[PDB]
């Protein structure tokens, strides 16, 4: 546990991911109680969450800029303080616009900390970028799962403001305390090291961006429609709880696995295989899941296993393609895709399902995954290395 060992900083990045996962994955519990003090459910709390997700598209690039320039310490301090000041008082605000502002502050801090953890993992493990990125993304995926019942009990007994206050204080304090410790291995611009503006000129960036955006778009509807489809089949409630747990566990655990697989073979081949399997599984999901509880759980596990790997495949690809020195800003620009996908995912899954049938909804999700597969297989490998056009002094 000394300073200088790469695995110490990998553990710290995973801890940061677990500490910032609460903003995204604890929202279901707070949605109804916060709404009860305020107006409409679908409008107020869900638009607050949507704004918190969208603000990351500008939050993570700037935090990555400051990380690449001045190291990760001060930017991580700022992100932790932002998460603190936003998430702590979301239970003590009496107006909806104040809730919007605080949730956006917390989401921006979360985006900054996610970018910082990912960049630390990529820098400290240049030879195992996929594996470190997968471990950090899994920590962000599985962060709140152990304490979800505890925070539910706190909400039930002590109230909404108390729960928000406790969680925000814990998250902010722990992130800030980690900020004192983490450090980078060492700016030297190289030929293959791209600036963010220089990256925004290559077609490879945009192909990867559309693939990631389509993956996130299909994933929103996959998560929104998977368990409710199991309820529509008529499965037992325990089967549905097991399915939810399997979804979360596999969406978390597939990321280090797919990172290692990409390390052993390559970014593009692994992306193609994973996205093709995900597209096929999503296309066959409504038909196969009817076979019973076992088939439903197996399809959920396989689909989420093949969907979650992108959050580990894309960061390592960005570090390999657009340079390590400026990588933190570029992966924020890649994160803009997941931020943009959340604009529509509010009620889109339920709308598509109830309007055009479950089969067509899962076919649309499979078509998104197939767009990603086609981009990974046929489009991006033929382009080769980025060209670095329109360089400026």
């Amino acid at each position: 546990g000394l300073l200088g060992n790469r695995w110490f900083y990998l553990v710290l990045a995973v801890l940061l991911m677990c500490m910032i996962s609460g903003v995204q994955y604890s929202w279901t519990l707070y949605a109804n109680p916060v709404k009860d003090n305020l107006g409409v459910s679908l409008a107020a709390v869900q638009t607050a969450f949507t704004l918190s997700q969208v603000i990351q598209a500008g939050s993570q690039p700037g935090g990555g800029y400051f990380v690449d320039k001045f190291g990760p310490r001060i930017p991580l301090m700022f992100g932790g303080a932002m998460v603190l000041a936003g998430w702590t008082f979301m239970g003590m605000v009496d107006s909806v616009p104040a809730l919007y502002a605080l949730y956006t502050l917390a989401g921006a801090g979360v985006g900054i900390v996610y970018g910082i953890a990912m960049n630390t993992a990529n820098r400290w493990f240049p030879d195992k970028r996929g594996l470190a990125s997968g471990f950090t993304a899994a920590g962000y995926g599985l962060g709140v799962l152990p304490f979800l019942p505890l925070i539910s009990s706190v909400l039930k007994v002590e109230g909404v403001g108390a729960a928000f206050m406790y969680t925000g204080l814990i998250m902010g304090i722990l992130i800030i305390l980690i900020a004192f410790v983490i450090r980078f291995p060492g700016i030297v611009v190289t030929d293959k090291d791209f600036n963010s503006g220089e990256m925004l000129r290559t077609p490879q960036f945009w192909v990867l961006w559309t693939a990631f955006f389509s993956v996130n778009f299909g994933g929103l509807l996959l998560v929104a429609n998977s368990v409710p489809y199991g309820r529509s089949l008529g499965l037992a409630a325990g089967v549905l709880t097991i399915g939810v747990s399997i979804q979360n566990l596999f969406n978390g655990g597939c990321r280090p696995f797919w990172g290692f697989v990409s390390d052993k073979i390559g970014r593009y081949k692994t992306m193609s295989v994973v996205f093709g399997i995900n597209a096929v599984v999503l296309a066959l999901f409504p038909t196969i899941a009817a076979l019973g509880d076992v088939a439903f759980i197996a399809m959920l596990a396989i689909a989420f296993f093949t969907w979650g790997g992108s959050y580990a495949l894309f960061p390592s690809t960005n570090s390999d393609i657009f340079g390590t020195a400026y990588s933190a800003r570029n992966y924020g620009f890649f994160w803009a895709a997941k931020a943009t996908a959340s604009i529509f995912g509010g009620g889109l899954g339920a709308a598509i399902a109830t309007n055009f049938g479950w089969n067509t909804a899962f076919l649309i999700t499979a078509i998104t995954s197939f767009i990603a597969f086609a981009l990974a297989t046929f489009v991006i490998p033929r382009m080769g290395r980025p060209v670095k056009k329109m360089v400026k002094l």
Partner: antibody
Amino acid sequence: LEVMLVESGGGLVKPGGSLKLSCAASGFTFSNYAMSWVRQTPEKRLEWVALISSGGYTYYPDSVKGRFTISRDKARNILHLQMSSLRSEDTAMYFCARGPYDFDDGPPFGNWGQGTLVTVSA
Amino acid sequence: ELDIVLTQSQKFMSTSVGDRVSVTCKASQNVGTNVAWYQQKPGQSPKALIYSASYRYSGVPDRFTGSGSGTDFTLTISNVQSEDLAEYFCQQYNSYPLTFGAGTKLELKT
């Protein structure tokens, strides 16, 4: 707005015979909700009899499976319970209840109807 | 056996207006938190009180609460009123077949 469930078709019938119970539904579509038939014994004991899901899949307990058939008519929003091979145990009052919403968590019997009585004895 | 069985210990319970009562439901198998509580007034069909063993509906009074997990569940009626006296059953929907409790009738002490 309000959910309405009207049971009908109950009667006094000799055992070993047929019967058809109808449940007229109002205020919701049979697509996004599940429906169930539950009877109560004259000794005030409840036995869940049948449950048809959103997609049309049917579940019956082993005690009354095979004899009874639960179905629905989406065009007219009627839940049908076909009864055959009536036994002395089948004497009970049947209610139709709507289950959880496809995207919502809830019990299999959210709202209950008035209920219709089916008696098969001497 | 394969079928789960919910047993309510109190077939008959006597109480007074304004007091605290608890109806207990003991499951033969682990059903987690997928348990509901229904109230059947003598002349009407059962009305849904509790879902998920801890959540009540909108329009269900704050007098009724639910707690428990695993195999042990409790429906607590705090500040019992005259209308509260009716029959209460616990139903598990964790797994098929769906089963009901014996039934607890609440009446005033003679």
